Design an enzyme around this catalytic site. Structure first.
Site, PDB file in Angstrom:
ATOM      1  CD  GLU A 127      15.171   9.760  -6.209  1.00 25.59           C
ATOM      2  OE1 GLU A 127      14.529  10.771  -6.545  1.00 25.59           O
ATOM      3  OE2 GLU A 127      15.829   9.699  -5.158  1.00 25.59           O
ATOM      4  CG  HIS A 146      21.576  14.789  -8.875  1.00 23.33           C
ATOM      5  ND1 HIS A 146      20.950  15.894  -9.404  1.00 23.33           N
ATOM      6  CD2 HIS A 146      20.588  13.985  -8.408  1.00 23.33           C
ATOM      7  CE1 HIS A 146      19.640  15.761  -9.270  1.00 23.33           C
ATOM      8  NE2 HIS A 146      19.393  14.610  -8.670  1.00 23.33           N
ATOM      9  CG  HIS A 170      17.470  12.700 -11.167  1.00 24.21           C
ATOM     10  ND1 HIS A 170      17.089  12.571  -9.848  1.00 24.21           N
ATOM     11  CD2 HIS A 170      16.619  11.931 -11.884  1.00 24.21           C
ATOM     12  CE1 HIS A 170      16.055  11.754  -9.774  1.00 24.21           C
ATOM     13  NE2 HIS A 170      15.750  11.352 -10.994  1.00 24.21           N
ATOM     14  CG  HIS A 197      21.727  15.828  -0.592  1.00 23.59           C
ATOM     15  ND1 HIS A 197      22.272  17.059  -0.293  1.00 23.59           N
ATOM     16  CD2 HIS A 197      20.962  16.011  -1.694  1.00 23.59           C
ATOM     17  CE1 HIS A 197      21.852  17.947  -1.175  1.00 23.59           C
ATOM     18  NE2 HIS A 197      21.055  17.337  -2.036  1.00 23.59           N
ATOM     19  CG  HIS A 252      18.822  10.095  -6.620  1.00 18.96           C
ATOM     20  ND1 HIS A 252      17.961  10.596  -5.671  1.00 18.96           N
ATOM     21  CD2 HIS A 252      19.080  11.121  -7.466  1.00 18.96           C
ATOM     22  CE1 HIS A 252      17.698  11.864  -5.936  1.00 18.96           C
ATOM     23  NE2 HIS A 252      18.363  12.208  -7.022  1.00 18.96           N
ATOM     24  CB  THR A 268      13.239  13.056  -5.871  1.00 19.82           C
ATOM     25  OG1 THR A 268      14.605  13.230  -6.272  1.00 19.82           O
ATOM     26  CG2 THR A 268      12.366  12.803  -7.104  1.00 19.82           C
TER      27      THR A 268
HETATM   28 ZN   LIG Z   1      17.301  13.947  -8.079  1.00 16.00          ZN
END
Ligand SMILES: [Zn+2]
Length: 261
Positions: free
Chosen positions: A107, A95, A120, A65, A97, A199
């Site tokens: 996010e 990581h 992140h 993911h 997103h 998250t």
């Molecule tokens: Zn994250």
């Protein structure tokens, strides 16, 4: 291994997460929209301590993911102090997103504005002795969030984006030694900080959010890469990891602080 049920599809999308993970409607969820107009300042706030010096990158792993760059956190190799925090957080991994398009995919959003991807950096308070444990306390984890806006190719964000090919599917891992995390940190470190959560399921509400006002850049040619990545695993029905970000949640009775202001 480590399976994975939830996701970012129509049925497994962040929209339904609330099911197996009820807290997704919790009183401290992430992300959120920082309303600069309402940001508040707390005299007790200090400048971000990003002691990433001794930091030693291990591998990069596609957890199905997102992809992760893991650091050795058995010592204070690299930590995060001061800032809105109290105590010492050990960087365990970082990581990003991204979104299905350059125009969205972050996010956290500042004044509803969205960026391509959002980095992140995950640290866990040491007073709890380990990531797992610390991860269940109101103040166990702390995430330093850096934005990414389409612009010039990032030399730094490339050593990373490179190896992605060698870990295209869920589960694959690449030895990614000698990478410096700070190298993805802007040079200006004003930040916004609020009490949130992870998250992603379990969505545990034990994260302190330090979202840096200054975004770092990435060349659109780079964002395409993030998408090359695969959601499934070597043998399943190829499913591209195009989108994987949680929309902003209710701030509820929380308040985003600002430093300097
Ligand atoms: Zn994250």
């Amino acid at each position: 291994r480590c399976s994975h049920h939830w996701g970012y599809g129509k049925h497994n999308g962040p929209e339904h997460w609330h099911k197996d993970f009820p807290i997704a409607n919790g009183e401290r969820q992430s992300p959120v929209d920082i309303d600069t107009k309402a940001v508040v300042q707390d005299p007790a706030l200090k400048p971000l301590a990003l002691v990433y010096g001794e930091a030693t990158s291990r591998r990069m792993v596609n957890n199905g993911h997102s992809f992760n760059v893991e650091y050795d956190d058995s010592q204070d190799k690299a930590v995060l102090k001061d800032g809105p925090l109290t105590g010492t957080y050990r960087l365990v991994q970082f990581h990003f997103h991204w979104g299905s398009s350059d125009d969205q995919g972050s996010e956290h959003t500042v004044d509803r504005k969205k960026y391509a991807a959002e980095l992140h950096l995950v640290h866990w308070n040491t007073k709890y002795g380990d990531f797992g444990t610390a991860a269940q306390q109101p103040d166990g984890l702390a995430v330093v969030g850096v934005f990414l806006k389409v612009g010039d190719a990032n030399p730094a964000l490339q050593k990373v984006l490179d190896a992605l090919d060698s870990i295209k599917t869920k589960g694959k891992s690449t030895d990614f030694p000698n990478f410096d995390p700070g190298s993805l940190l802007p040079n200006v470190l004003d930040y916004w900080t609020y009490p949130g959560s992870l998250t992603t399921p379990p969505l545990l509400e034990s994260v302190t959010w330090i979202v840096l006002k200054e975004p770092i850049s990435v060349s659109s040619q780079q964002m395409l890469k993030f998408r090359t990545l695969n959601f499934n695993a070597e043998g399943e029905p190829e499913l591209l990891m195009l989108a994987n970000w949680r929309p902003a949640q209710p701030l509820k009775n929380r308040c985003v602080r600002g430093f300097p202001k």
